[model samples]
Target: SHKIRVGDALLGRLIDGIGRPMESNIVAPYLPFERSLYAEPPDPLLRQVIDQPFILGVRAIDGLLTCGIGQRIGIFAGSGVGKSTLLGMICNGASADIIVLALIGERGREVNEFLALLPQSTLSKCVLVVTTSDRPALERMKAAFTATTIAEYFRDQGKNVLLMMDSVTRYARAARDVGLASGEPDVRGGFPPSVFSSLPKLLERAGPAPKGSITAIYTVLLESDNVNDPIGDEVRSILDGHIVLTRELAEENHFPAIDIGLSASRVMHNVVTSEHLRAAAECKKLIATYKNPELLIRIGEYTMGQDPEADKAIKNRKLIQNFIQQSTKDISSYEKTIESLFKVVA
Candidate 1:
């Protein structure tokens, strides 16, 4: 004898199989779930838990590092990496309940693909701040800040906002050019000596993911020859995490060479559930125990003038390259892969 209630009215005999309450509105048969419209009201606890974290459909990455409300995440890599591709997956595949803002920081070209791929509804929820390369350096500087300000507004209103900056490195480079023109002291690689000083101000402006608030994801190009290179030391030290897309292995056609060992974030441990955490730990352990060592050995043998096995390895590597390249064809496949991997670990 179960019944469901909506605003000012009760619908009787709403039980389904197993005597569970049928959770739907007869008036709107197309809508299978009516929890939002029910008069019993939404449970605060349930809403809080489900709403606070923006779940990017990429499960493994999400389970490894859930973007908590108000969290600022940094994606660091070299140019031509799949930063925008990955970011688009996160933004578009996000749950229907949250809001996403994608800020194209002086890389409008990169954003175009995503804009075309996203549905109109998802696009409506997003805010695109286009700053092209030809724009004045000062204008680019303001674009990043302006985008953050808009994200902060939605965040304060209890909306889960996602802000994606395609390449903050270009923004930094622009600042350096301005500094030189202003007669400032030059620092490493033509950057202003005080570049580090200005970064905190920008990062500090990012309010923490409040309970039921926004999450910001940033993609930046970091100059480095290897994972341990000190070129991006200052930027690395400040970020909560770093995912480096390297080209070292790309010579062998390992496109999208995301160094799993090097990809890490301090915030991941705090945000994801214990179940997910354990899964990720086991997955990483298994990968290290089996895949990593074998791949490295094959790569080493190929690199050390061994020709016979090199051709076969190169073929296998090319297959992987094709798979990664397919991600650009449609982000759903990329997101599905990420989600499936994490679910296996989770």
Candidate 2:
């Protein structure tokens, strides 16, 4: 739908499938519009430590989930459980230099809605690479890598980039399609046996950049929300951070709807503030307490007739639940975010 050209007239424009700019009514610019999307990350002459926090601007994720740069994270959900909205929030609120999003085998509507949702200031920092469902299977398969290729470019330019693939399931399916083309057999009636090989090629691209960072946050949908499902088994085994969003939480109207008990991040666990750790752990503990038995249990937890600590716990739970539900416009307010943490800790 566009042509390729060169120039400094870079805003409000489109680029070809290659990196050349489309010839606009304006002028021209660039280096080369090509780079290999493969090969190993080169060894640096000197090594640098990379433990800085990459704030995603969601209070639950920042203070409770405890994220950082240069790690692998997955947001899990079934359909319509707010995974996309969480991604959008991260795009809008992430404290980073550039964001690369891969729209592989998803709807154009998904891509446009994400764009329409981002403010101009935020949109400027984004790099969206799309290969919608209607595209060729090969395009869908390579889409994740193409997005990462672009991110690696900016990353080598000394910028922090967050790469997100809306769902890796499609990419995996495309890999399986490659398997089919090669006459390879499917595994367990669903996943390709080669999935073990293919998924990591994309997932491992995120981590410890020599001069910068590429933090990859990929989303995956469980066919049945079954933790033991085929493709999920491989992906979950390799995560630095894993977050599961459940339908029950969505039904309850939680904004992020991330299940704390099921969610765990080694990086987050190792890097959290004592205040945050304590608060996050306390909330999860209460969630465990609140999840079992009967309304008899609920009565014991919340309405235990002048049991001060029990009543206090229930009040804190509601407050934190309500706090996570801020409107999109209110996501970046520091006072409210800090207030959520303080409420849980109190």
Candidate 3:
């Protein structure tokens, strides 16, 4: 059986799927802060409204695609499009008391690269649960469960917890393996019915409790660059918001590479300030109008100052574009994030 404690000893530690130590030879002493491994979600009657912003220091997310505490958000993207890089940045910069990162069914080389990317400051607040591709399917599935269980333990103690799962698509695939091995019939996309049910149970565990919150950021890897995959669609339907990262933007060397036109946050209105909200709208407006100028330039039908509206929009869109692109190591506060956007939209 798996269990966790609300103790500081577990912080800065690397553990396997079932909560066993992987970092040091010394085992942590048992503390009085023990909690159930599979704690149930807080009672709905006791849960609070998700009306506060959880700033993820990036301007693109903080100013435009905002989500509140306890909201579940997904990073939807194809392979090799900076999905893990963006996830690393969020793990470093998000304003949360604790971060629980689950690396499920990833390559050992990729996992090492990810760990090396994180700095010491972020490592101090993180609990890493790793299950590599070499692991059994059941172990990979249990890794996800263990990470969430640890997050819930911290949430119960009134600390804001950010739970990040890199590539939940792998987790679902692992579930399918377990299902097939157990003689379960294949359903949609060769995923067993249990895979569908397990996701909701896992995701719904993240939310505002009476004392604290668990805000989840899940990465959904798209196979064959298909965003309409059954698992991605199912995860999107369950999550509060999704940020789509596109290969086109990445090809243009946009650091974050988020396709704002395809991304949205359902709960940002409840938490975003009116000024920030309007600025975000303006940012989108200019970017939306960019095609007009871009098309004319491509077809050689327009000069620099041919159309005033197009020129103005083109300039504004450039500023907004630069504002959204950020370094993986950069960190900005919520106020600074909105203030910078306000400048471009002004």
Candidate 4:
């Protein structure tokens, strides 16, 4: 297991050291492998090992957005829609062979903070392609391609690489700019008709799960009902799966207002094992029962509320809150509650 040890004074020193600028040197001690080895063809065994099954840590979220080794998951949302925040959580939680981050049209500050928070092991295995918003539009287009190329390189080395692209929409928009500047006929979304044609090159980079090879997750912005809406049809159709994040539900005070019902992966049935499916089904049944209106109202009166409607809502909320709290506090308590509820519902 990996561990870090530090006293307060040591931690303070480390923090101070990070603030001071240091000379850049290409050479460092503790270099493990020969540079030439990376140039050679990847070992078949290495590929096989990487293709082994693993899970993303968020049980509820991962249960819905199932990703396996050598899978490509596309996450699409509008601007300021928590796409990056979701990506950050996944990157922090994943135990993949490697992670390559391609940040096109993202501000430098966001990328810097993301990298700083990542575990050193994750950082050591990561390759970041950051194209700042201020860069030339043409450069932004190239950065996407560049990041994918690096991902392919690592994939060929029998490494499982998670490729994260933030806002592929910006790249598409840049292509539109290049086309219009060159006097090409503008098509839908202010992009040249060739925008669709050019996407295959990036997408073709992903292939069927190679034994012990790479997988990817792409974060892209989509055109919603308005320019601000993150859910867009163009992005939704092409991805293997999508995790749609929405805030409108949260305005009603819903926590984790993520609408899993709106998001789905066609490939998930093929990837997840039977055991996981069984467990997930049980979880779903419990959730459905918990949300039932009639039983909730009876529970409300039992718990002590005079106004029928308000009492029912309060009871329902309390039940859910207790369920959540107990689930987090003790697994056995959660299982027992589920069992008791299942007996009643059945």
TM-score of each: 0.64, 0.84, 0.92, 0.67
Measured on C-alpha atoms, candidate 3 has an lDDT of 0.84
lDDT of 1 by residue, 18-75 (tens): 1222336556322232221112222232333222444665543554445555555677
Alpha-carbon lDDT, every model? 0.51, 0.69, 0.84, 0.52
Better of 2 and 4 by lDDT: 2
> Using alpha carbons, what is the TM-score of model 4?
0.67
True-vs-predicted CA distance for residue 300, candidate 1, Å: 20
In model 4, which residue pairs have backbone atoms overlapping below 3 Å?
Answer: 47-211, 47-212, 51-212, 77-230, 78-230
List ranges where model 4 is wrong by over 4 Å. 1-54, 79-81, 209-212, 222-232, 249-257, 282-346
Looking at candidate 4, what is the lDDT of residue 323? 33
Q: Model 2 clash pairs?
A: 6-28, 6-29, 7-28, 7-29
lDDT of 4 by residue, 129-153 (tens): 6676877776676666655655565
lDDT tens string, model 3, 58-161?
Answer: 78989898988999999988876888788888888898999999999989999999998789999988988999999899888888888898888888779999
Instruction: Give candidate 3 misplaced runs (Cα > 4 Å).
Output: 2-6, 27-37, 225-228, 292-309
Ranking by lDDT: 3, 2, 4, 1
